[PDB]
């Protein structure tokens, strides 16, 4: 067998995650989202979004925008717990970290003050932070101050996963692989089976900050936001 | 950002759960239950159950009754492990804690000697313990001695979750959101697709007390009990 | 209530698992596999496989063979992390432990150098190691040196589970209950709903060794291998 020392990114990520689990009470709430309406909006909007904003329109900014709005309407999730002083801090800014798969390991660059950004500014920030993280061109400020994380677990086809949150953060939302499924729809009391583009949306939360019912209300706001798919003015094409 | 000290319920719940994970070997077994027959029984029985027993008939007492019977036929699950003496204690009483979402945080009031109660007495005990927990009118004895916990994770629409068990308890059963799904049914070798009211029933267990095959046998007894839906004499209308 | 001391198998298994979670960063990636083609191959091959190799042909050796090939093409998964020296060791041999449910508790006997075995030799090794583990006739060498574990969580009907990996191992793959499901198939752009024999394939991995994208690539190789079901020359009937 052969041995090699890991780089500092993998060494620090591993140590931070081993420690994270020992100082928090993590659970993974499982929710699902019907992404069919967003998939149709995305298909027709991709050429116009590429021409006006210079980036490829993916599902991730839809999830990030819905999460940012939900972190503002559920400020109890955009919060941190201090086990020594037994105090909760509800953060004014929404600093969303984006998990980026890089050749050197996982990096989670932060979109600071994401509550002040438009949908296109979020899409451009994801592309910019990911390109710089993959080229290992991030400033130290780019990895500090996260209040929440969104991880694209579906990039390598995972149906779901149990993402690890890292205190002081209280939640991490996963955007699992969007797959066609046989699901029940109802219209005027008529239950029927449709083929819909669904994805699991696991949400790992720390019971020190968020209880199970709070996690449920939080993902219900995001689920309803994405399923309604009222993003035409957000796309601003 | 703003800071406030958490109440004693949230402070103690958080600390007990952080510690629980460090002194146990928790896994979450995933099972599903076809609740359609119970849903039909419940719909027709609700007016008569409200008139005779004074409570609204929900799915929770069906799960609690099936769990109590299964804790009596699987006494290895109604048990506790002592890591110092390397001893297992199989408890004579079935003291089922019910997770209640309250304005002050999660409370888990205990139905002591639940193996001695009728189905209506269990339904009335859930309503009574929940009302008192929400009004913070519980006696100290009401929160002690639990041998098992049942948590209604479906109250805020969760498909599933990974509930945290708290030693000395060895299992916690979740009753996730009952949703209409496209599922396969078989009759005389004819596989067909039906619309059924299904729910995931996650079961978190401590490998110190219950192994994976034991968890499977335990949830199979409960799954079969609920799917058969022979609760007419239990409803006693 | 009654108390009895647990045997050494259950005492050591429990302690090793409590410790395993505290010194690793475990996540459970969720994947699914369409086992219908393997189920059809297995049904027609069982009489000939029993006559030539002397064992009953089950799904488990298909999963083990696909996992062994994937541990050779993904050598980053057949690896161990040393948190003190911050070094990764990629193991030359694939020593697959098989979780066996025994009357005395869980035992995980190891198939050493599984990369050097034929599909029938793997099927015969599972039967041999399981029979000896159930009769508690294992040599000490039979439980040492595992680089990966495969656990048949579906034996007692579990839809899925979150198996606990034990360092220095970096992954544990679960073969959950194969159940008939309503799933979408596509042929020349025609989406349609079929009844397929599916199973969840949870994969618990240590973020100290394997990141989420690596876990996804690893299970995608296994998923594609089993779904293609090109096992005729492997069966060698
Ligand atoms: C930086 C990153 C998050 C950007 O994600 P993104 O905005 O979706 O962009 P990508 O360039 O990777 O997307 C590639 C394509 O796959 C699609 N896609 C990405 N994730 C998807 C998912 N979960 N389900 C379905 N389609 C998805 C995108 O819409 C895009 O489609 P298109 O080419 O048809 O327009 C991503 O590259 C990445 O690193 N993902 C891995 C995150 C990670 O490591 N998480 C840890 C757990 S795996
Ligand atoms: C105390 C408590 C458990 C009682 O549960 P209950 O017996 O189902 O009673 P509720 O009054 O809450 O039920 C409201 C209605 O929703 C239904 N319902 C409740 N849980 C359900 C579920 N999992 N799936 C579908 N329907 C459900 C009930 O049947 C009832 O329906 P009806 O009005 O048509 O008769 C509940 O109020 C509660 O606190 N739940 C949250 C538990 C918790 O915090 N768990 C932690 C993880 S979220
Ligand atoms: C040793 C062991 C792994 C062998 O598994 P195996 O090769 O599938 O063999 P078994 O004799 O147990 O299989 C019995 C039958 O069920 C089938 N079966 C087993 N697992 C199955 C699954 N996940 N889904 C569907 N069918 C399955 C087999 O194909 C066989 O079918 P057949 O009689 O029609 O030919 C198994 O006996 C065992 O101990 N399983 C439990 C493992 C465990 O404890 N894991 C911990 C988490 S539960």
């Amino acid at each position: 067998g052969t041995t090699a020392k890991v780089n500092r990114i993998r060494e620090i990520t591993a140590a931070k995650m081993v420690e994270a689990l020992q100082i928090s009470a993590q659970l993974t709430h499982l929710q699902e989202v019907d992404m069919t309406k967003i998939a149709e909006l995305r298909k027709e909007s991709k050429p116009a979004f590429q021409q006006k904003y210079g980036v490829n329109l993916t599902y991730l900014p839809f999830f990030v925008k819905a999460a940012v709005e939900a972190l503002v309407s559920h400020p109890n999730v955009n919060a941190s717990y201090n086990a020594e002083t037994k105090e909760m801090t509800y953060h004014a800014d929404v600093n969303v970290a984006i998990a980026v798969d890089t050749p050197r390991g996982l990096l989670t660059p932060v979109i600071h003050k994401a509550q002040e950004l438009t949908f296109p500014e979020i899409a451009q920030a994801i592309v910019d932070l990911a390109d710089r993280a993959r080229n290992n061109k991030l400033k130290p400020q780019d990895l500090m101050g996260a209040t929440f994380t969104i991880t694209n677990i579906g990039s390598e086809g995972a149906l779901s996963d149990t993402p690890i949150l890292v205190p002081p953060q209280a939640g991490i939302l996963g955007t699992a692989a969007i797959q066609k499924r046989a699901v029940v729809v109802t219209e005027d009391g008529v239950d029927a089976i449709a083929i819909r583009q669904m994805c699991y949306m696991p949400f790992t939360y720390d019971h020190q900050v968020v209880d199970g019912a709070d996690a449920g209300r939080f993902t219900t706001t995001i689920k309803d936001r994405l399923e309604t798919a009222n993003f035409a003015d957000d796309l601003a094409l």
Side-chain angles (χ1 to χ4, degrees), chain A residues 205-235:
Chain A
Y205 61 103
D206 185 2
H207 212 291
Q208 288 184 119
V209 186
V210 175
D211 69 26
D214 283 333
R217 295 180 194 105
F218 178 74
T219 66
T220 297
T221 294
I222 298 173
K223 188 222 216 309
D224 295 5
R225 175 62 162 129
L226 301 160
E227 286 185 352
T228 296
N230 188 10
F231 287 93
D233 295 319
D234 277 302
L235 295 180

PDB file of all heavy atoms in Angstrom, chain A residues 205-235:
ATOM      1  N   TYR A 205     -29.752  20.100  10.700  1.00  0.00           N
ATOM      2  CA  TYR A 205     -29.883  21.199  11.649  1.00  0.00           C
ATOM      3  C   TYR A 205     -29.390  20.811  13.021  1.00  0.00           C
ATOM      4  O   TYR A 205     -29.388  19.627  13.374  1.00  0.00           O
ATOM      5  CB  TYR A 205     -31.344  21.654  11.714  1.00  0.00           C
ATOM      6  CG  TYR A 205     -32.312  20.588  12.167  1.00  0.00           C
ATOM      7  CD1 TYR A 205     -32.825  20.591  13.453  1.00  0.00           C
ATOM      8  CD2 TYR A 205     -32.763  19.611  11.288  1.00  0.00           C
ATOM      9  CE1 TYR A 205     -33.742  19.635  13.865  1.00  0.00           C
ATOM     10  CE2 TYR A 205     -33.669  18.643  11.690  1.00  0.00           C
ATOM     11  CZ  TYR A 205     -34.162  18.661  12.979  1.00  0.00           C
ATOM     12  OH  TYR A 205     -35.086  17.723  13.373  1.00  0.00           O
ATOM     13  N   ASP A 206     -28.960  21.812  13.801  1.00  0.00           N
ATOM     14  CA  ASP A 206     -28.459  21.589  15.145  1.00  0.00           C
ATOM     15  C   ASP A 206     -29.608  21.801  16.113  1.00  0.00           C
ATOM     16  O   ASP A 206     -30.171  22.905  16.157  1.00  0.00           O
ATOM     17  CB  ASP A 206     -27.295  22.546  15.422  1.00  0.00           C
ATOM     18  CG  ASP A 206     -26.583  22.350  16.744  1.00  0.00           C
ATOM     19  OD1 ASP A 206     -26.960  21.421  17.494  1.00  0.00           O
ATOM     20  OD2 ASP A 206     -25.669  23.133  17.043  1.00  0.00           O
ATOM     21  N   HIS A 207     -29.985  20.758  16.878  1.00  0.00           N
ATOM     22  CA  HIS A 207     -31.072  20.901  17.842  1.00  0.00           C
ATOM     23  C   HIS A 207     -30.753  21.928  18.941  1.00  0.00           C
ATOM     24  O   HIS A 207     -31.651  22.322  19.681  1.00  0.00           O
ATOM     25  CB  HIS A 207     -31.474  19.573  18.481  1.00  0.00           C
ATOM     26  CG  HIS A 207     -32.940  19.533  18.812  1.00  0.00           C
ATOM     27  ND1 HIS A 207     -33.486  20.322  19.824  1.00  0.00           N
ATOM     28  CD2 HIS A 207     -33.939  18.848  18.218  1.00  0.00           C
ATOM     29  CE1 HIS A 207     -34.780  20.052  19.837  1.00  0.00           C
ATOM     30  NE2 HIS A 207     -35.103  19.180  18.887  1.00  0.00           N
ATOM     31  N   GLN A 208     -29.494  22.358  19.061  1.00  0.00           N
ATOM     32  CA  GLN A 208     -29.145  23.413  19.995  1.00  0.00           C
ATOM     33  C   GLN A 208     -29.760  24.759  19.565  1.00  0.00           C
ATOM     34  O   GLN A 208     -29.912  25.646  20.400  1.00  0.00           O
ATOM     35  CB  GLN A 208     -27.623  23.572  20.089  1.00  0.00           C
ATOM     36  CG  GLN A 208     -26.890  22.458  20.811  1.00  0.00           C
ATOM     37  CD  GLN A 208     -25.434  22.789  20.920  1.00  0.00           C
ATOM     38  OE1 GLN A 208     -24.895  22.909  22.022  1.00  0.00           O
ATOM     39  NE2 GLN A 208     -24.768  22.971  19.782  1.00  0.00           N
ATOM     40  N   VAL A 209     -30.058  24.940  18.274  1.00  0.00           N
ATOM     41  CA  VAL A 209     -30.539  26.206  17.739  1.00  0.00           C
ATOM     42  C   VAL A 209     -31.959  26.081  17.163  1.00  0.00           C
ATOM     43  O   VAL A 209     -32.804  26.955  17.388  1.00  0.00           O
ATOM     44  CB  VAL A 209     -29.562  26.705  16.630  1.00  0.00           C
ATOM     45  CG1 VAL A 209     -29.940  28.102  16.145  1.00  0.00           C
ATOM     46  CG2 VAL A 209     -28.112  26.664  17.095  1.00  0.00           C
ATOM     47  N   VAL A 210     -32.196  25.011  16.392  1.00  0.00           N
ATOM     48  CA  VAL A 210     -33.435  24.743  15.669  1.00  0.00           C
ATOM     49  C   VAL A 210     -34.058  23.399  16.111  1.00  0.00           C
ATOM     50  O   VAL A 210     -33.364  22.375  16.074  1.00  0.00           O
ATOM     51  CB  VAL A 210     -33.078  24.709  14.163  1.00  0.00           C
ATOM     52  CG1 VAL A 210     -34.270  24.327  13.311  1.00  0.00           C
ATOM     53  CG2 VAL A 210     -32.498  26.037  13.709  1.00  0.00           C
ATOM     54  N   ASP A 211     -35.342  23.391  16.547  1.00  0.00           N
ATOM     55  CA  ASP A 211     -35.991  22.121  16.886  1.00  0.00           C
ATOM     56  C   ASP A 211     -36.593  21.508  15.574  1.00  0.00           C
ATOM     57  O   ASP A 211     -36.577  22.165  14.525  1.00  0.00           O
ATOM     58  CB  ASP A 211     -37.023  22.287  18.027  1.00  0.00           C
ATOM     59  CG  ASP A 211     -38.298  23.063  17.726  1.00  0.00           C
ATOM     60  OD1 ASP A 211     -38.713  23.106  16.543  1.00  0.00           O
ATOM     61  OD2 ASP A 211     -38.913  23.578  18.678  1.00  0.00           O
ATOM     62  N   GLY A 212     -37.083  20.275  15.635  1.00  0.00           N
ATOM     63  CA  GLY A 212     -37.640  19.597  14.462  1.00  0.00           C
ATOM     64  C   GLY A 212     -38.798  20.307  13.791  1.00  0.00           C
ATOM     65  O   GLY A 212     -38.850  20.385  12.569  1.00  0.00           O
ATOM     66  N   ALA A 213     -39.725  20.860  14.574  1.00  0.00           N
ATOM     67  CA  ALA A 213     -40.855  21.604  14.031  1.00  0.00           C
ATOM     68  C   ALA A 213     -40.366  22.891  13.327  1.00  0.00           C
ATOM     69  O   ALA A 213     -40.908  23.260  12.289  1.00  0.00           O
ATOM     70  CB  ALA A 213     -41.837  21.929  15.132  1.00  0.00           C
ATOM     71  N   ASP A 214     -39.342  23.551  13.862  1.00  0.00           N
ATOM     72  CA  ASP A 214     -38.750  24.723  13.219  1.00  0.00           C
ATOM     73  C   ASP A 214     -38.106  24.345  11.891  1.00  0.00           C
ATOM     74  O   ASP A 214     -38.259  25.085  10.926  1.00  0.00           O
ATOM     75  CB  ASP A 214     -37.687  25.380  14.114  1.00  0.00           C
ATOM     76  CG  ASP A 214     -38.272  26.199  15.236  1.00  0.00           C
ATOM     77  OD1 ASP A 214     -39.429  26.708  15.072  1.00  0.00           O
ATOM     78  OD2 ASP A 214     -37.581  26.346  16.280  1.00  0.00           O
ATOM     79  N   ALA A 215     -37.401  23.188  11.839  1.00  0.00           N
ATOM     80  CA  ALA A 215     -36.781  22.696  10.618  1.00  0.00           C
ATOM     81  C   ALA A 215     -37.848  22.454   9.549  1.00  0.00           C
ATOM     82  O   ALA A 215     -37.675  22.864   8.404  1.00  0.00           O
ATOM     83  CB  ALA A 215     -35.999  21.418  10.898  1.00  0.00           C
ATOM     84  N   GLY A 216     -38.969  21.858   9.951  1.00  0.00           N
ATOM     85  CA  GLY A 216     -40.100  21.600   9.074  1.00  0.00           C
ATOM     86  C   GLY A 216     -40.714  22.865   8.511  1.00  0.00           C
ATOM     87  O   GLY A 216     -40.995  22.930   7.311  1.00  0.00           O
ATOM     88  N   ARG A 217     -40.911  23.887   9.358  1.00  0.00           N
ATOM     89  CA  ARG A 217     -41.473  25.146   8.883  1.00  0.00           C
ATOM     90  C   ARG A 217     -40.521  25.828   7.924  1.00  0.00           C
ATOM     91  O   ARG A 217     -40.956  26.387   6.921  1.00  0.00           O
ATOM     92  CB  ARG A 217     -41.810  26.081  10.043  1.00  0.00           C
ATOM     93  CG  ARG A 217     -42.906  25.535  10.922  1.00  0.00           C
ATOM     94  CD  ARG A 217     -43.236  26.446  12.067  1.00  0.00           C
ATOM     95  NE  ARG A 217     -44.041  25.722  13.048  1.00  0.00           N
ATOM     96  CZ  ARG A 217     -43.577  25.271  14.213  1.00  0.00           C
ATOM     97  NH1 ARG A 217     -42.323  25.518  14.578  1.00  0.00           N
ATOM     98  NH2 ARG A 217     -44.372  24.598  15.035  1.00  0.00           N
ATOM     99  N   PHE A 218     -39.221  25.755   8.212  1.00  0.00           N
ATOM    100  CA  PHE A 218     -38.190  26.360   7.398  1.00  0.00           C
ATOM    101  C   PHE A 218     -38.173  25.748   6.003  1.00  0.00           C
ATOM    102  O   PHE A 218     -38.176  26.500   5.033  1.00  0.00           O
ATOM    103  CB  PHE A 218     -36.823  26.207   8.091  1.00  0.00           C
ATOM    104  CG  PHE A 218     -35.664  26.760   7.299  1.00  0.00           C
ATOM    105  CD1 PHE A 218     -35.468  28.125   7.187  1.00  0.00           C
ATOM    106  CD2 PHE A 218     -34.758  25.911   6.682  1.00  0.00           C
ATOM    107  CE1 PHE A 218     -34.390  28.634   6.478  1.00  0.00           C
ATOM    108  CE2 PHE A 218     -33.688  26.421   5.958  1.00  0.00           C
ATOM    109  CZ  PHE A 218     -33.516  27.779   5.851  1.00  0.00           C
ATOM    110  N   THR A 219     -38.157  24.405   5.888  1.00  0.00           N
ATOM    111  CA  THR A 219     -38.110  23.757   4.568  1.00  0.00           C
ATOM    112  C   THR A 219     -39.439  23.864   3.828  1.00  0.00           C
ATOM    113  O   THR A 219     -39.436  23.749   2.611  1.00  0.00           O
ATOM    114  CB  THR A 219     -37.680  22.288   4.650  1.00  0.00           C
ATOM    115  OG1 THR A 219     -38.674  21.534   5.350  1.00  0.00           O
ATOM    116  CG2 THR A 219     -36.306  22.115   5.273  1.00  0.00           C
ATOM    117  N   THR A 220     -40.560  24.053   4.540  1.00  0.00           N
ATOM    118  CA  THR A 220     -41.870  24.218   3.915  1.00  0.00           C
ATOM    119  C   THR A 220     -41.919  25.565   3.193  1.00  0.00           C
ATOM    120  O   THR A 220     -42.465  25.634   2.097  1.00  0.00           O
ATOM    121  CB  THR A 220     -42.989  24.100   4.949  1.00  0.00           C
ATOM    122  OG1 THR A 220     -42.948  22.784   5.505  1.00  0.00           O
ATOM    123  CG2 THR A 220     -44.377  24.381   4.359  1.00  0.00           C
ATOM    124  N   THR A 221     -41.324  26.626   3.777  1.00  0.00           N
ATOM    125  CA  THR A 221     -41.260  27.932   3.122  1.00  0.00           C
ATOM    126  C   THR A 221     -40.463  27.823   1.801  1.00  0.00           C
ATOM    127  O   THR A 221     -40.888  28.361   0.769  1.00  0.00           O
ATOM    128  CB  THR A 221     -40.598  28.966   4.063  1.00  0.00           C
ATOM    129  OG1 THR A 221     -41.427  29.197   5.208  1.00  0.00           O
ATOM    130  CG2 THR A 221     -40.291  30.278   3.368  1.00  0.00           C
ATOM    131  N   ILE A 222     -39.305  27.119   1.839  1.00  0.00           N
ATOM    132  CA  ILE A 222     -38.446  26.953   0.663  1.00  0.00           C
ATOM    133  C   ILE A 222     -39.136  26.076  -0.398  1.00  0.00           C
ATOM    134  O   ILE A 222     -39.097  26.388  -1.593  1.00  0.00           O
ATOM    135  CB  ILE A 222     -37.081  26.357   1.078  1.00  0.00           C
ATOM    136  CG1 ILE A 222     -36.326  27.288   2.039  1.00  0.00           C
ATOM    137  CG2 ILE A 222     -36.241  25.962  -0.139  1.00  0.00           C
ATOM    138  CD1 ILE A 222     -35.077  26.714   2.626  1.00  0.00           C
ATOM    139  N   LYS A 223     -39.778  24.982   0.046  1.00  0.00           N
ATOM    140  CA  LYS A 223     -40.458  24.038  -0.832  1.00  0.00           C
ATOM    141  C   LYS A 223     -41.561  24.746  -1.590  1.00  0.00           C
ATOM    142  O   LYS A 223     -41.585  24.671  -2.804  1.00  0.00           O
ATOM    143  CB  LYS A 223     -41.017  22.858  -0.021  1.00  0.00           C
ATOM    144  CG  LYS A 223     -41.582  21.723  -0.858  1.00  0.00           C
ATOM    145  CD  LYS A 223     -42.891  21.220  -0.251  1.00  0.00           C
ATOM    146  CE  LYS A 223     -43.136  19.745  -0.364  1.00  0.00           C
ATOM    147  NZ  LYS A 223     -42.974  19.237  -1.757  1.00  0.00           N
ATOM    148  N   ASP A 224     -42.388  25.537  -0.890  1.00  0.00           N
ATOM    149  CA  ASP A 224     -43.496  26.278  -1.496  1.00  0.00           C
ATOM    150  C   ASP A 224     -42.979  27.331  -2.444  1.00  0.00           C
ATOM    151  O   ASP A 224     -43.509  27.459  -3.547  1.00  0.00           O
ATOM    152  CB  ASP A 224     -44.401  26.905  -0.419  1.00  0.00           C
ATOM    153  CG  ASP A 224     -45.140  25.880   0.444  1.00  0.00           C
ATOM    154  OD1 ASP A 224     -44.875  24.644   0.280  1.00  0.00           O
ATOM    155  OD2 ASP A 224     -45.979  26.305   1.299  1.00  0.00           O
ATOM    156  N   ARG A 225     -41.927  28.071  -2.040  1.00  0.00           N
ATOM    157  CA  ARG A 225     -41.310  29.074  -2.898  1.00  0.00           C
ATOM    158  C   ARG A 225     -40.881  28.468  -4.275  1.00  0.00           C
ATOM    159  O   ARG A 225     -41.317  28.973  -5.320  1.00  0.00           O
ATOM    160  CB  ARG A 225     -40.097  29.701  -2.185  1.00  0.00           C
ATOM    161  CG  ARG A 225     -39.306  30.685  -3.029  1.00  0.00           C
ATOM    162  CD  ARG A 225     -40.106  31.906  -3.462  1.00  0.00           C
ATOM    163  NE  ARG A 225     -39.207  32.982  -3.883  1.00  0.00           N
ATOM    164  CZ  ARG A 225     -39.298  33.654  -5.024  1.00  0.00           C
ATOM    165  NH1 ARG A 225     -40.259  33.375  -5.889  1.00  0.00           N
ATOM    166  NH2 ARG A 225     -38.427  34.610  -5.309  1.00  0.00           N
ATOM    167  N   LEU A 226     -40.090  27.361  -4.263  1.00  0.00           N
ATOM    168  CA  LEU A 226     -39.600  26.702  -5.483  1.00  0.00           C
ATOM    169  C   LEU A 226     -40.716  26.046  -6.309  1.00  0.00           C
ATOM    170  O   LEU A 226     -40.665  26.082  -7.539  1.00  0.00           O
ATOM    171  CB  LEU A 226     -38.554  25.635  -5.137  1.00  0.00           C
ATOM    172  CG  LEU A 226     -37.319  26.115  -4.395  1.00  0.00           C
ATOM    173  CD1 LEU A 226     -36.626  24.956  -3.691  1.00  0.00           C
ATOM    174  CD2 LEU A 226     -36.388  26.827  -5.311  1.00  0.00           C
ATOM    175  N   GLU A 227     -41.708  25.431  -5.650  1.00  0.00           N
ATOM    176  CA  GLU A 227     -42.794  24.760  -6.354  1.00  0.00           C
ATOM    177  C   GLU A 227     -43.731  25.753  -7.025  1.00  0.00           C
ATOM    178  O   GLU A 227     -44.261  25.441  -8.095  1.00  0.00           O
ATOM    179  CB  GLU A 227     -43.557  23.843  -5.410  1.00  0.00           C
ATOM    180  CG  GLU A 227     -42.738  22.613  -5.105  1.00  0.00           C
ATOM    181  CD  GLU A 227     -43.420  21.557  -4.270  1.00  0.00           C
ATOM    182  OE1 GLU A 227     -44.533  21.821  -3.758  1.00  0.00           O
ATOM    183  OE2 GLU A 227     -42.844  20.455  -4.141  1.00  0.00           O
ATOM    184  N   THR A 228     -43.926  26.947  -6.428  1.00  0.00           N
ATOM    185  CA  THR A 228     -44.746  28.000  -7.043  1.00  0.00           C
ATOM    186  C   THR A 228     -44.027  28.514  -8.304  1.00  0.00           C
ATOM    187  O   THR A 228     -44.694  28.792  -9.311  1.00  0.00           O
ATOM    188  CB  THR A 228     -45.045  29.114  -6.030  1.00  0.00           C
ATOM    189  OG1 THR A 228     -45.823  28.566  -4.969  1.00  0.00           O
ATOM    190  CG2 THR A 228     -45.782  30.298  -6.647  1.00  0.00           C
ATOM    191  N   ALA A 229     -42.674  28.593  -8.251  1.00  0.00           N
ATOM    192  CA  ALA A 229     -41.746  28.950  -9.322  1.00  0.00           C
ATOM    193  C   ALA A 229     -42.019  30.330  -9.911  1.00  0.00           C
ATOM    194  O   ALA A 229     -41.898  30.528 -11.126  1.00  0.00           O
ATOM    195  CB  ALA A 229     -41.762  27.891 -10.416  1.00  0.00           C
ATOM    196  N   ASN A 230     -42.352  31.300  -9.052  1.00  0.00           N
ATOM    197  CA  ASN A 230     -42.602  32.657  -9.516  1.00  0.00           C
ATOM    198  C   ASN A 230     -41.273  33.417  -9.582  1.00  0.00           C
ATOM    199  O   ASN A 230     -41.003  34.287  -8.751  1.00  0.00           O
ATOM    200  CB  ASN A 230     -43.593  33.333  -8.595  1.00  0.00           C
ATOM    201  CG  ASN A 230     -44.066  34.676  -9.089  1.00  0.00           C
ATOM    202  OD1 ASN A 230     -43.815  35.080 -10.239  1.00  0.00           O
ATOM    203  ND2 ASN A 230     -44.744  35.403  -8.216  1.00  0.00           N
ATOM    204  N   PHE A 231     -40.423  33.068 -10.556  1.00  0.00           N
ATOM    205  CA  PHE A 231     -39.101  33.659 -10.651  1.00  0.00           C
ATOM    206  C   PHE A 231     -38.890  34.531 -11.889  1.00  0.00           C
ATOM    207  O   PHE A 231     -37.755  34.910 -12.140  1.00  0.00           O
ATOM    208  CB  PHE A 231     -38.046  32.550 -10.636  1.00  0.00           C
ATOM    209  CG  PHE A 231     -37.847  31.912  -9.287  1.00  0.00           C
ATOM    210  CD1 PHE A 231     -38.549  30.777  -8.929  1.00  0.00           C
ATOM    211  CD2 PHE A 231     -36.959  32.449  -8.376  1.00  0.00           C
ATOM    212  CE1 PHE A 231     -38.347  30.177  -7.688  1.00  0.00           C
ATOM    213  CE2 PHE A 231     -36.791  31.876  -7.128  1.00  0.00           C
ATOM    214  CZ  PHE A 231     -37.472  30.733  -6.795  1.00  0.00           C
ATOM    215  N   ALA A 232     -39.938  34.880 -12.636  1.00  0.00           N
ATOM    216  CA  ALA A 232     -39.783  35.688 -13.849  1.00  0.00           C
ATOM    217  C   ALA A 232     -39.171  37.073 -13.565  1.00  0.00           C
ATOM    218  O   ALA A 232     -38.241  37.469 -14.267  1.00  0.00           O
ATOM    219  CB  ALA A 232     -41.115  35.836 -14.567  1.00  0.00           C
ATOM    220  N   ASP A 233     -39.683  37.814 -12.560  1.00  0.00           N
ATOM    221  CA  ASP A 233     -39.114  39.130 -12.230  1.00  0.00           C
ATOM    222  C   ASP A 233     -37.726  38.981 -11.593  1.00  0.00           C
ATOM    223  O   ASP A 233     -36.904  39.883 -11.721  1.00  0.00           O
ATOM    224  CB  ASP A 233     -40.047  39.923 -11.317  1.00  0.00           C
ATOM    225  CG  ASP A 233     -41.348  40.269 -12.004  1.00  0.00           C
ATOM    226  OD1 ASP A 233     -41.310  40.634 -13.209  1.00  0.00           O
ATOM    227  OD2 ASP A 233     -42.409  40.172 -11.347  1.00  0.00           O
ATOM    228  N   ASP A 234     -37.450  37.844 -10.938  1.00  0.00           N
ATOM    229  CA  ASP A 234     -36.149  37.560 -10.349  1.00  0.00           C
ATOM    230  C   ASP A 234     -35.106  37.331 -11.444  1.00  0.00           C
ATOM    231  O   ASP A 234     -33.976  37.770 -11.301  1.00  0.00           O
ATOM    232  CB  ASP A 234     -36.229  36.340  -9.415  1.00  0.00           C
ATOM    233  CG  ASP A 234     -36.721  36.707  -8.036  1.00  0.00           C
ATOM    234  OD1 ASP A 234     -36.087  37.564  -7.391  1.00  0.00           O
ATOM    235  OD2 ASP A 234     -37.749  36.155  -7.610  1.00  0.00           O
ATOM    236  N   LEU A 235     -35.486  36.666 -12.536  1.00  0.00           N
ATOM    237  CA  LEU A 235     -34.580  36.426 -13.651  1.00  0.00           C
ATOM    238  C   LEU A 235     -34.228  37.721 -14.382  1.00  0.00           C
ATOM    239  O   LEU A 235     -33.136  37.819 -14.933  1.00  0.00           O
ATOM    240  CB  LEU A 235     -35.186  35.426 -14.634  1.00  0.00           C
ATOM    241  CG  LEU A 235     -35.396  34.014 -14.121  1.00  0.00           C
ATOM    242  CD1 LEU A 235     -35.993  33.152 -15.204  1.00  0.00           C
ATOM    243  CD2 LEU A 235     -34.115  33.407 -13.600  1.00  0.00           C
TER     244      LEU A 235
END
